[PDB]
Design a protein around this ligand. Structure first.
Ligand SMILES: NC(=O)c1ccc(Nc2nc(N)c(N=O)c(OCC3CCCCC3)n2)cc1
Lengths: 297, 253
């Protein structure tokens, strides 16, 4: 329904999976939007194809809303609802205060809602990280940047391997399993949950083995007991150092009993035992949950 | 998520359904020219070792595009190429490059890319369509136990349906997939559309019957059909050479 003529560009915001995002306002309605601008020879990039067609299907208060696609022959423009900042930039600003527990709780809860909705609609996000989780001044957090997402089938088949930013990448991808699923998005969320509490990345590795070993040193090296099939996975090595699992109360010390229970389910090695977003919503961690406005900005 | 996804797909397949009549409204192209095109797409898929889902998606795109855009026979292939390009870009880990599509067709690269954008507009970017393949794959989980020949035979019959607009435009992916699954499982094991799938889908042999009669004919007539890329394709070991099995003579319905 749109035309570039009604938007006033306001400032550049950044560069996500592809193209570029600017803050802009609609001159006629007043509405602040984010414009993603796509320069168009492979024609329309698979990322834009995926993002657009999947985002069209996903209309949910915890998924960023695609308002419109303005479709020139030179340029493709995605008009999104505007959100005020991302989770990473918010964690930095809470540097001294810390984020208050009820905000962590509300954001996780909301994130699990948005993920549950994606999984329910056969969509994998595959790039959950603080830079792609956007917050508004009313207390909403929302999943954004679906350029890496995809429509899966039941049961899944082999999909791209090079997937999820390293720090947030699940062990089954690190170990080269030919099948991965919804559980990969949960891993990411688990990591981010840890991160919202400590204000620092849980597994900040610099390479894939460094990533595994950091994961291994916290959750203990997995074996056939904890995770049947591991020792048969393509990139599994019998030479891996074998670390004892650490007590969770030391992984994320400020977390209470319910918090810890939740994170451990979110971080189970075996994708089949890893909690689902759907199931996670009913967890006793969330029993007193509310939706406070962000204590800052 | 198995039930939520299935429910969601049952809703989309209605919204994603082409106009049953469309070919009668096309001045210049016929059911039989679409069959040639689809048969060709099958070759492209085998040449480039594309997923079966990809092919299914392309056919969905072409039918929908053709439901609202009137096309001349000299262009039908242009549409098909772009459709297959978009399906590859959506579905494949490694889509063939634009160049490879230009080469398999002549139209220029500029034409292919312009058509691609046209198809996106006409489809308003709604590319995540349910397919016979997505349904079958779910149905397969109800085999006791899994049998590879049943799966490949079902996929084969499902695919065969892409070729003939009449009659298959009138049936929804989830229904063709059910006829295919029953037909395959019967041909190979003598077993039937199982109870558990009645619970899942709501379909019975009675509701499946119409499509099932058409499928059983398509099957028996398959060696004779002017189009043969699917039969050829399914001689491959990869699909257990199911296209060499004999169709049953009767269904006992
Ligand atoms: N820290 C910041 O400065 C700020 C201010 C605003 C902001 N807003 C907003 N809204 C969107 N709807 C959107 N995408 O859909 C988006 O993408 C921004 C991109 C940036 C590159 C990585 C992916 C996310 N940004 C986001 C951040």
């Amino acid at each position: 329904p749109g035309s570039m003529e009604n938007f006033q560009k306001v400032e550049k915001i950044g560069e996500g999976t592809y193209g570029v995002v600017y803050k802009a306002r609609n001159k006629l309605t007043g509405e602040v939007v984010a414009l993603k601008k796509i320069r168009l020879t492979e024609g329309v990039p698979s990322t834009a194809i995926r993002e657009i067609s999947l985002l069209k299907e996903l209309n949910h208060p915890n998924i960023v809303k695609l308002l419109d696609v303005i479709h020139t022959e030179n340029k493709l423009y995605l008009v999104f609802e505007f959100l005020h900042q991302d989770l990473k930039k918010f964690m930095d600003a809470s540097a001294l205060t810390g984020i208050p527990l009820p905000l962590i709780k509300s954001y996780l809860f909301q994130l699990l809602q948005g993920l549950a909705f994606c999984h329910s609609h056969r969509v994998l996000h595959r790039d959950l990280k603080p830079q792609n989780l956007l917050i508004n001044t009313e207390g909403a957090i929302k999943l954004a940047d679906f350029g890496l997402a995809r429509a899966f089938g039941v049961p899944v088949r082999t999909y791209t391997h090079e997937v999820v930013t390293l720090w947030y990448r699940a062990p089954e991808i690190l170990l080269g399993c030919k099948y991965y699923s919804t559980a990969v998005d949960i891993w990411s969320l688990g990591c981010i949950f840890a991160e919202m509490v400590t204000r620092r990345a849980l597994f900040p590795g610099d390479s894939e083995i460094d990533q595994l070993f950091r994961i291994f040193r916290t959750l203990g090296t997995p074996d056939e007991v904890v995770w049947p099939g591991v020792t048969s996975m393509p990139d599994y090595k019998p030479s891996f150092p074998k670390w004892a699992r650490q007590d969770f109360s030391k992984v994320v010390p400020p977390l209470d009993e319910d918090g810890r229970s939740l994170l451990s389910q979110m971080l189970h090695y075996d994708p089949n035992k890893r909690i689902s977003a759907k199931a996670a919503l009913a967890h006793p961690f969330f029993q007193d949950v509310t939706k406070p406005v962000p204590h800052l900005r | 998520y198995h039930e939520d996804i299935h429910t969601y797909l049952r809703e989309m397949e209605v919204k994603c359904k082409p106009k049953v009549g469309y070919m009668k409204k096309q001045p210049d192209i016929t059911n039989s020219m679409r069959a040639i095109l689809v048969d060709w797409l099958v070759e492209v898929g085998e040449e480039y070792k594309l997923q079966n889902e990809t092919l299914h998606l392309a056919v969905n795109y072409i039918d929908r595009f053709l439901s609202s855009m009137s096309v001349l026979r000299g262009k039908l292939q242009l549409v098909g190429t772009a459709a297959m390009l978009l399906a590859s870009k959506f579905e494949e880990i490694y889509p063939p490059e634009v160049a490879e599509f230009v080469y398999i067709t002549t139209y220029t690269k500029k034409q292919v890319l312009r058509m691609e954008h046209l198809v996106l507009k006409v489809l308003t970017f709604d590319l995540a369509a349910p397919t016979v393949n997505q349904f079958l794959t779910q149905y397969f989980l109800h085999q006791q136990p899994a049998n590879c020949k049943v799966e490949s035979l079902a996929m084969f019959l499902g695919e065969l349906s892409l070729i003939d607009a009449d009659p298959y435009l009138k049936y929804l992916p989830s229904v063709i997939a059910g006829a295919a699954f029953h037909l395959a499982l019967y041909t190979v094991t003598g077993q039937s559309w199982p109870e558990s799938l009645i619970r899942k889908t709501g379909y019975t042999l009675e509701s499946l019957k119409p499509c099932l009669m058409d499928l059983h004919q398509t099957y028996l007539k398959a060696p004779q059909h002017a189009q043969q890329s699917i039969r050829e394709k399914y001689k491959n070991s990869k699909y257990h050479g199911v296209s060499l099995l004999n169709p049953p003579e009767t269904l006992n319905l």
